């Protein structure tokens, strides 16, 4: 398959990260081969962690929301800016009917006064 | 206690697993069989729903009623140069031979190159004002995020041409001499 | 019989609009400094309301 | 019959009014801010942009199929009508 192709390359990329987990979750749950020990320990963080994360997230967050619904805002304006316009004349001329899911009209002179079968 | 405090966050992250390889499994099938017909809304909704549901999932598994993510130990303990069976009896066949370098491979605690400058990003926009104006931005955000979920909880809460009193009286009318004298 | 067509012009070149109205509310809201909050709020409520009269 | 035609298309009119709402709804349901509690806050504003992006793409996506169902009763209403039909045959 030469198109996405890296789009495939890309999902075993969290593929295989993923399976890792799985991997070292279920020898972590299995009792042998595996050292159990709580170390309680903290990491010190220089800068507000929640507070500091908080100036990018949301505001990255915000933006990309806006610009994704630029994204398809535009999208439509031009797509919209013929089809019914003839669809008007059969309608007048002639005659029209719906059976189905396709449109249809008959010729014989019923509409006249023509006794044919 | 504590063991399974681990083990009933770390059983629902693993059977993520099995949510997610249903996913991969069956687009891995799917775009090679059915790389025509393309319909970009039926892809856009799958990529949707695993954003939506795995994202979420894995985090409310991970940062809650979960073991503090600095407190536990990854430890590798056996590893040998030929193939090891116990682990492609868990992978079901994923990550083979099981070499002496793959163990070491398997902890790629390492980020992507481009975290590296993503970081030094992280050191540069702090040469200029930090945390000193983007923090009273952040607040007044928040309160106006406030404001706004303030306006949804405020903004989320014929005639009769026939008449048969009138038709029974007319049928009524004519019947006999009432109404004309 | 161009009256009904007129009726789904209205349905259609309204959403333009609708686009615009969404745009001048996200970019009064993004300002920092919003004197005309009542133009603000009277856009977010034309654009809820007006999606119902469509 | 016609009336089970005329209550499809109100499900899908009555669906098509429900889908904008749920889209509109589950935007600012996230954006609410709340303490972390072992959280190890690095994967979670990426979690909820990557999310937020979709959901806008719904609204976009529910605005298409707007256009698209509204034209799929178009031509519904386009071959049954009385503005001039008895009208302009005489003409």
């Known amino acids: 398959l030469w198109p996405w192709d890296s789009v495939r390359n890309n999902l075993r990329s969290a593929l295989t990260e993923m399976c890792v987990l799985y991997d070292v979750l279920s020898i972590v749950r299995d009792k042998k081969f595996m050292t159990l020990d709580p170390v309680s320990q903290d990491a010190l963080p220089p800068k507000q962690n929640p507070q500091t994360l908080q100036l990018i997230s949301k505001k990255k967050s915000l933006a990309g929301a806006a610009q994704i619904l630029l994204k398809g805002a535009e999208r439509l304006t031009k797509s919209v800016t013929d089809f019914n316009s003839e669809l008007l004349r059969l309608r007048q001329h002639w005659k029209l009917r719906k059976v189905g899911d396709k449109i249809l009209g008959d010729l014989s002179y019923r509409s006249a006064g023509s006794l044919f079968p | 206690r504590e063991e399974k405090q681990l083990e009933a966050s770390l059983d629902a992250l693993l059977s993520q697993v099995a949510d997610l390889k249903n996913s991969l499994g069956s687009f891995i099938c799917k775009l090679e069989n059915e790389y025509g017909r393309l319909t970009w809304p039926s892809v856009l909704d799958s990529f949707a729903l695993l954003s939506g549901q795995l994202n979420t999932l894995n985090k409310v598994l991970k940062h809650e009623k979960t073991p503090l993510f600095r407190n536990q130990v990854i430890i590798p303990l056996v590893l040998s140069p030929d193939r090891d069976e116990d682990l492609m009896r868990q992978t079901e066949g994923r990550v083979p031979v099981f070499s002496h370098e793959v163990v070491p491979d398997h902890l790629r605690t390492k980020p992507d190159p481009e975290v590296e400058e993503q970081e030094k990003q992280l050191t540069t926009d702090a040469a200029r004002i930090g945390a000193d104006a983007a923090q009273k931005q952040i607040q007044s955000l928040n309160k106006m995020c406030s404001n706004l979920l303030e306006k949804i909880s405020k903004e989320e809460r014929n005639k009769q041409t026939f008449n048969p009193t009138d038709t029974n009286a007319l049928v009524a009318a004519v019947a006999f001499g009432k109404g004309l004298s | 019989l161009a009256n009904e067509r007129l009726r789904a012009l209205e349905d259609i070149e309204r959403e333009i609009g609708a686009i615009l109205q969404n745009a001048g509310t996200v970019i009064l809201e993004l300002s920092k400094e919003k004197t005309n909050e009542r133009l603000l709020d009277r856009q977010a409520a034309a654009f809820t309301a007006s999606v119902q009269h469509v | ?91």
Not at chain 4, 18 to 41: C, G, L, P, Y
Not at chain 4, 70 to 75: A, E, H, M, N, R
């Open chain 4, 1 to 91: 019959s016609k009336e089970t035609l005329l209550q499809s298309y109100n499900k899908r009119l009555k669906d098509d009014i429900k889908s904008i709402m749920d889209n509109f709804t589950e935007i600012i349901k996230t954006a609410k801010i709340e303490d972390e509690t072992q959280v190890s806050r690095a994967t979670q504003g990426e979690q909820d942009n990557y999310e937020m992006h979709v959901r806008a793409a719904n609204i976009v996506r529910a605005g298409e199929s707007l256009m698209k169902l509204v034209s799929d009763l178009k031509q519904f209403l386009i071959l049954n009508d009385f503005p001039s039909v008895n009208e302009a045959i005489d003409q």
